[PDB]
Amino acid sequence: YNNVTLKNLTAFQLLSQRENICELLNLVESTERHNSIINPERQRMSLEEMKKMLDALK
Amino acid sequence: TQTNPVPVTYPTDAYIPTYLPDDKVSNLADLKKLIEMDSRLDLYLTRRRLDTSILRCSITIQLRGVDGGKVQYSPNLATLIGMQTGSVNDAVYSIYKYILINNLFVTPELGEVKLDSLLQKVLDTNAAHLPLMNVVQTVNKLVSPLPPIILDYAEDTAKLREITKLALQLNSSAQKYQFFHELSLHPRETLTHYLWSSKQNELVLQGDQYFNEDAARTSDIYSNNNNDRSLMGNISLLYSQGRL
Amino acid sequence: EKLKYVKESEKMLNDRLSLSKQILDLNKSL
Amino acid sequence: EKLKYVKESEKMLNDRLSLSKQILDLNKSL
């Protein structure tokens, strides 16, 4: 798995190219890959860390 | 370390995208400032890390402190240096600076020195020219050790790995942005591109299905597959090359 | 300070060699 | 080290002055 092949590159490009067309028709959900990376409680926890760094640096 | 850098498996500081519109982000400049701040601070640290080093019997007792920090000099070399028992590198530097004071090289022309009185006395040689390599080789012979007592009668790697993984996720999100933006501007000649390239990549993935175990031990490749035409047409060529 | 240590220590070492070259005089007259 | 070399240097200066006293002994041994 350390190396890549022509089959691996072609499969990766075909998979990533069919995932992009299925968002126009909305026949795939992809809410998990969205919200596991947005994660708004993690976002406000990080903003609280930035606010605490503003408090500690002033 | 080596003379060349070490290849390694995991990525190391992949790029930051530059094609995102700055009317919405207005933040990649600030992260850029943080990155060159880190590079400047690391430059300072690396420079300072480099520059921080820049019958009657006798009594014989081999002590605890047989130590080469102060090593005994031969008395000829002690007269040439002046110090009593200092060190070995101090001796080499003092001999070389004595040679450099007396202007003996040339006014191999810089290898050969002019042998003077005291230096021939401390080397027990009588040449006029003798190269400096052998002169400083003799220093290893002229020095003897000190006499004993005689009486007679990290987390930073994982953190940078996490930042690299996160920058790769940023690249993925930016490429997925740019696809839909370029489809939004002119949609015709990207949907034709999709219908071409998806078909071509399907043909490329289906270029390998007749090379299995039990798809070649059987007979449904050679017989009756003139629909395929790919192999069993090379046999007019391969016999003519002698391979068989 | 790194300069003003070395520019005095090298003069001290030059004096230590010149004193040996003057001790050369006091063993010729004996 | 901004202390330390100075902690050496004056010491070396004293040795020079001390060697000057030995020079005075060379002015009295003859």
Side-chain angles (χ1 to χ4, degrees):
Chain A
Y1 293 99
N2 298 115
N3 55 3
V4 295
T5 62
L6 192 274
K7 184 178 179 180
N8 286 319
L9 292 173
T10 305
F12 179 75
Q13 186 179 3
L14 183 143
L15 189 274
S16 178
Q17 190 175 3
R18 293 190 298 180
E19 287 183 353
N20 289 321
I21 195 65
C22 291
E23 292 181 354
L24 290 177
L25 302 176
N26 198 0
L27 59 92
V28 68
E29 300 294 326
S30 69
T31 62
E32 293 85 4
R33 279 82 179 272
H34 187 199
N35 202 3
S36 66
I37 307 300
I38 294 297
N39 198 1
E41 56 90 21
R42 181 180 63 86
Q43 185 176 2
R44 65 178 294 276
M45 182 267 177
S46 180
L47 186 61
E48 285 180 353
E49 283 186 348
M50 303 302 282
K51 187 183 288 184
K52 188 266 296 295
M53 190 175 288
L54 263 293
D55 185 74
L57 269 297
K58 290 179 74 67
Chain B
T1 184
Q2 291 182 356
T3 313
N4 296 116
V6 177
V8 77
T9 62
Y10 60 95
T12 304
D13 190 73
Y15 290 107
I16 300 298
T18 185
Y19 50 86
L20 290 172
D22 291 331
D23 57 355
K24 296 181 177 68
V25 174
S26 296
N27 292 319
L28 289 174
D30 215 10
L31 178 60
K32 186 187 290 182
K33 289 183 180 180
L34 291 174
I35 289 170
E36 66 242 7
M37 185 189 290
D38 194 5
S39 297
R40 185 176 179 180
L41 188 60
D42 197 6
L43 187 69
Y44 184 81
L45 287 174
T46 303
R47 184 187 61 78
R48 185 72 266 173
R49 287 285 182 87
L50 190 143
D51 205 3
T52 189
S53 178
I54 293 299
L55 57 90
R56 294 292 297 274
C57 294
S58 65
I59 296 171
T60 60
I61 298 169
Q62 187 175 3
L63 294 173
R64 180 180 62 84
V66 180
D67 294 328
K70 292 178 72 68
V71 189
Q72 191 183 5
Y73 294 164
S74 66
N76 289 319
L77 181 141
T79 53
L80 189 141
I81 294 174
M83 294 185 288
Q84 183 179 2
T85 59
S87 291
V88 49
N89 53 4
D90 293 331
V92 175
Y93 176 70
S94 65
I95 291 167
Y96 185 74
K97 191 169 175 65
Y98 180 77
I99 295 170
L100 192 145
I101 286 169
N102 288 320
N103 288 317
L104 296 174
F105 300 100
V106 143
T107 60
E109 64 271 16
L110 297 175
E112 290 181 352
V113 297
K114 289 183 180 179
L115 274 295
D116 287 332
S117 66
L118 288 177
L119 206 149
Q120 284 182 353
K121 285 183 179 180
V122 304
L123 295 189
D124 292 331
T125 60
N126 289 318
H129 293 286
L130 197 149
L132 189 146
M133 178 64 205
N134 292 318
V135 174
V136 193
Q137 276 292 321
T138 51
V139 177
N140 196 1
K141 185 175 180 179
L142 289 172
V143 177
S144 65
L146 191 147
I149 296 173
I150 300 168
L151 192 146
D152 195 2
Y153 291 101
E155 56 89 18
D156 198 2
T157 61
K159 189 71 171 64
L160 187 65
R161 189 188 301 272
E162 183 68 29
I163 297 169
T164 302
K165 180 171 73 174
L166 194 64
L168 290 173
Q169 295 178 357
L170 178 61
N171 288 316
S172 178
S173 298
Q175 290 181 355
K176 289 183 180 179
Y177 164 70
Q178 191 177 5
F179 178 74
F180 289 107
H181 188 195
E182 291 292 328
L183 189 145
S184 179
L185 292 176
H186 48 277
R188 185 68 177 268
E189 59 269 18
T190 180
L191 289 173
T192 61
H193 177 269
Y194 174 69
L195 292 179
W196 177 67
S197 179
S198 178
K199 185 67 64 66
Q200 294 296 321
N201 290 318
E202 284 180 354
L203 293 177
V204 169
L205 285 176
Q206 292 180 356
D208 190 3
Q209 75 275 19
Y210 289 166
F211 296 103
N212 301 116
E213 293 289 335
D214 288 329
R217 292 178 64 88
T218 184
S219 177
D220 286 330
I221 290 177
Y222 315 100
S223 65
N224 294 319
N225 284 316
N226 292 318
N227 197 1
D228 196 2
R229 199 268 310 273
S230 67
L231 72 159
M232 296 296 291
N234 298 113
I235 199 66
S236 297
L237 187 148
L238 291 175
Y239 179 72
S240 65
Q241 305 183 9
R243 300 172 173 181
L244 200 281
Chain C
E1 294 175 352
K2 290 177 70 175
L3 191 146
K4 289 182 181 179
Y5 177 74
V6 176
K7 73 181 289 183
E8 295 177 353
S9 67
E10 287 185 351
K11 290 182 181 179
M12 287 300 291
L13 196 147
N14 290 319
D15 292 331
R16 288 291 300 273
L17 294 176
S18 68
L19 288 176
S20 66
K21 286 178 93 288
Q22 290 184 358
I23 288 170
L24 286 174
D25 288 331
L26 291 175
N27 291 113
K28 291 179 182 178
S29 66
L30 293 176
Chain D
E1 290 182 353
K2 190 177 179 181
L3 191 146
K4 184 179 263 77
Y5 287 162
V6 178
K7 187 175 75 174
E8 296 292 329
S9 68
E10 293 176 352
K11 180 180 178 181
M12 294 298 291
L13 293 172
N14 195 1
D15 196 2
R16 180 176 290 172
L17 191 147
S18 180
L19 191 145
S20 178
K21 183 175 173 66
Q22 187 174 1
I23 295 170
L24 295 174
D25 294 330
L26 294 174
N27 297 118
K28 293 181 181 179
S29 65
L30 296 176

